[PDB]
Every structure is written in C-alpha cells, then in structure tokens.
C-alpha cells in the first residue's frame, strides 16, 4: 500500500475529510521534501499538495512526489482555503502552535478544524526498503565511529572528550550526532538523564555510551556499556543481567508480538536477577525520521510489531550513587523474526 493509501483510511476513522500536515517528519514522509521544516502538505479529497516557498522551487520540483504550490505563508493556506470549503480538516494538535491554528481558523472560516492528537502516532512505523537502506547507512556510520573511538575510552579521559571525538567523526563523515550524546561513567551511569560531563573515567568504572547518527535525514540509535579495568562484582552482575535481558527481548521479536509483552519479558528477567526496581520504564521505541517515534515498548503499549518496523531494545538498570548499565540495539522486524542492524561488539565485563 502507498503511503497515501495508508493515511486515508486513518483519516476516515478519525472522522475528517482532509489533513493539514505540519510536522516536518510527516511532511517529508508524505512528499519526499527534505527541507520539511519549510514545507506543509494538504491532504484533501482533491488529492495532496506540497506548500513551500520560492527558495525551494528547484529542490521541491526534484524531490516532491506531490504537486507544489509555491508561496510564503499566509498565501499558502489562503490558496488552500477553497479546497477545504465545507470540510472537516484535521490538523496535528501535538505539533501545531495555537497561533498557527488561529492563522488557519482565520483563513478557513467555512471549514471545521479538528484536532488530531495520538491519531498519527506510528504512521511511519513500517519502513520501505529505501528507508531501511537509509537507516542502515546511518547505523553503519555510527558503528564505524564507535569502533574508532572505543579504544580511547580508558582511565584518564573525560566523558566529554569521548563525546567530542564521536561528534567530530560523525560530522566529518557528512552526518551528525542524532541526539545529545551520553557518555556516562561510574556513578553517572546511574542517571539515565545525564549527558557527557567533565568527569574523568577511572579504573574500575563502567562507561555507558548512548549514541546515534543522523545521515541523509534518517536516524540510528544504540547503546553500549564497557568496562575500564575491573568493575566491582556488583556492577558485573548488573551488566550481565542487562545484557541477558536485552538479548532475551530481542529474541522474542517477530510480526505479531505485542510491544507490551516484550517489555514484560525484560521486566520479569531483571526482577529474577534482583534488579526489578532498578530498571528503565520503557524498553524501546521506533526509529526513523526521528530518533524517538512509534511504536512504543512500555507496559501499557497497545502496539503490535510488524515486518518493516525498526525499533530499539534497551533494558537498563541503575543503582543510584553507584553506577548503572544500559545496552541497546537497533532491530529490523522481518517476516519471520528480526535482524539486528547495530553491529558494534557487545563486550564482557
């Protein structure tokens, strides 16, 4: 099914006749336009149109699978007004600002604007082979850089300087760090929040490296924890439990498995190994045009995995004031199982 033919039944069930697409990732998903922060798409009974300004004329002509109307706001949605006369027009309420909604309300007085909240969650969950290729390229770059920087992770090095080395190499390759890099050593390993600080890595520390590459618009995501010297027996048990949990959750991936059941599998396992109050609250997420997108792997999730989806699996266990471990891989759901896309070594500790 085409992307448009995936989207239209969703709009029907949501009770709207049209959709103003404003989230850059969904503008790009639908049209192929790669400067999507400066584009908008109207999906309507008349078809679908990409709105962008004249700076982008040639680019949009080359990239867009949709016809273009070339102008600046407010001419864009004013031109669109006659198309949505008398229609229920959905909009992305978790993206659109109130001021932007007011602008549309003024332009479309004979339309009914309908807020869509969770409606388009996981719209992009299943990737095409072209999209998978782009994600593989991003993850391959991530793996290359991780492999290059790994030996520099040793006693005497600041967390921050490890992060700088990773960033430098991703950028030089024509990519970028996908999100604020995490390099968490020793007690900093217990904060899932923290990013690379000036703390100096020391003998005995575990070091958690949480990183992804953005390349050609697509993201990757993985997490590794490594030992510098010999860790405490406690931290070794924690590492071994998190790795056991990760590999077990990954091994249950297949079309039809419920995301919540994956989360439960990880929870139960960590609980069996004495870490059932120390663990992260979501097992993982979709990855694509955004680092964090549908599906969601939490206990309450109603998501069901299907072939073509790309997700993370990331159990974590944190011991406040002591240390913590996260291990994460990027997984493609296949027709009868899974394929791990993130190839960097997972070491013993």
174 binds a copy of itself (CB under 8 A): yes
Which CB, 165 or 328, lies closer to a copy of itself? 165
Considering only residues 136 to 165 of the shown chain, the ones binding Mn ion according to CB under 5 A are none
- Least CB distance to a copy of itself at residue 27 (A): 17
Could you tell me which residues are beta bridge partners of residue 337?
334
Gap between the Cα atoms of 267 and 36, Å rounded:
38
- Of the candidates 268, 338, 340, 253, which has an alpha carbon nearest to the alpha carbon of residue 303? 253
Q: Which one among 2, 5, 198, 256 touches a copy of itself, defined by CB under 8 A?
A: 198
- Least CB distance to Mn ion at residue 301 (A): 19
246 binds Mn ion (CB under 5 A): no
The stretch near Mn ion (CB under 5 A) out of 85-93, 114-122, 155-163, 208-216 is: 208-216
Cα 302 versus chain centre, distance: 18
Q: Which one among 131, 143, 210, 290 touches Mn ion, defined by CB under 5 A?
A: 210
Which CB, 263 or 328, lies closer to Mn ion? 328
37 binds a copy of itself (CB under 8 A): no
Q: Which one among 205, 221, 246, 303 touches Mn ion, defined by CB under 5 A?
A: 221
Gap between the Cα atoms of 128 and 113, Å rounded:
31
Q: Please, which contacts does 320-324 make with residues 24 or more away whose CB atoms are closer than 8 Å?
A: 320/190, 321/187, 321/190, 322/187, 322/190, 322/234, 322/235, 323/186, 323/187, 323/189, 323/190, 323/205, 323/206, 323/235, 323/238, 324/184, 324/189, 324/190, 324/191, 324/192, 324/206, 324/208, 324/238, 324/278
Which CB, 26 or 225, lies closer to Mn ion? 225
58 binds a copy of itself (CB under 8 A): no
70 binds a copy of itself (CB under 8 A): no
Q: What is the DSSP string of 52-86?
A: E-GGGHHHHHHH-SS-EEE--TTHHHHHHGGGGTT
- Least CB distance to a copy of itself at residue 252 (A): 31
321 binds a copy of itself (CB under 8 A): no
Q: Is 223 annotated as a binding residue?
A: yes
93 binds a copy of itself (CB under 8 A): yes
């Amino acid at each position: 099914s085409s992307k448009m033919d995936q989207l239209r039944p969703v709009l029907g069930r949501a009770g709207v006749d049209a959709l103003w697409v404003s989230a850059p990732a969904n503008v790009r998903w639908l049209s192929g336009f790669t400067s999507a922060e400066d584009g908008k798409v109207l999906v309507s009974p008349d078809g679908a149109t990409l709105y962008t300004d004249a700076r982008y004329t040639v680019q949009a002509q080359e990239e867009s699978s949709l016809p273009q109307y070339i102008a600046r706001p407010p001419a864009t949605y004013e031109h669109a007004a006659d198309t949505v006369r008398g229609l229920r027009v959905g909009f992305e309420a978790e993206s659109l600002t109130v001021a932007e909604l007011e602008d549309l309300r003024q332009a479309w007085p004979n339309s009914t604007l309908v807020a869509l909240r969770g409606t388009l969650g996981g719209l992009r969950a299943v990737k095409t082979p072209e999209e998978i290729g782009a994600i593989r390229a991003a993850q391959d770059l991530a793996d290359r850089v991780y492999t290059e920087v790994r030996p520099m992770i040793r006693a005497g090095v600041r967390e921050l300087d490890v992060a700088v080395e990773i960033e430098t190499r991703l950028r030089r390759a024509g990519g970028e760090s996908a999100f604020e890099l995490i390099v968490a050593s020793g007690p900093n390993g217990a904060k899932p929040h923290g990013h690379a600080s000036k703390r100096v890595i020391e003998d005995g520390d575990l070091v958690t490296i949480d990183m992804g590459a953005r390349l050609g618009g697509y993201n990757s995501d993985m997490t590794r924890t490594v030992a510098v010297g010999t860790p405490s027996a406690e931290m070794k048990r924690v590492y071994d439990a998190v790795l056991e949990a990760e590999e077990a959750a990954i091994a249950a991936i297949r079309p039809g498995v419920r995301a919540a059941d994956l989360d439960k599998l990880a929870r139960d396992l960590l609980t069996r190994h004495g870490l059932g109050e120390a663990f992260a609250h979501s097992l993982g997420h979709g990855v694509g045009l955004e680092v964090h997108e549908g599906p969601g792997l939490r206990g309450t999730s109603q998501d069901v995995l299907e072939a073509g989806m790309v997700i993370t699996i990331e159990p974590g266990a944190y011991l406040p004031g002591v240390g913590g471990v996260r291990i994460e891989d990027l997984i493609l759901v296949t027709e009868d199982g899974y394929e791990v896309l993130s190839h960097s070594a997972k070491e013993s500790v």
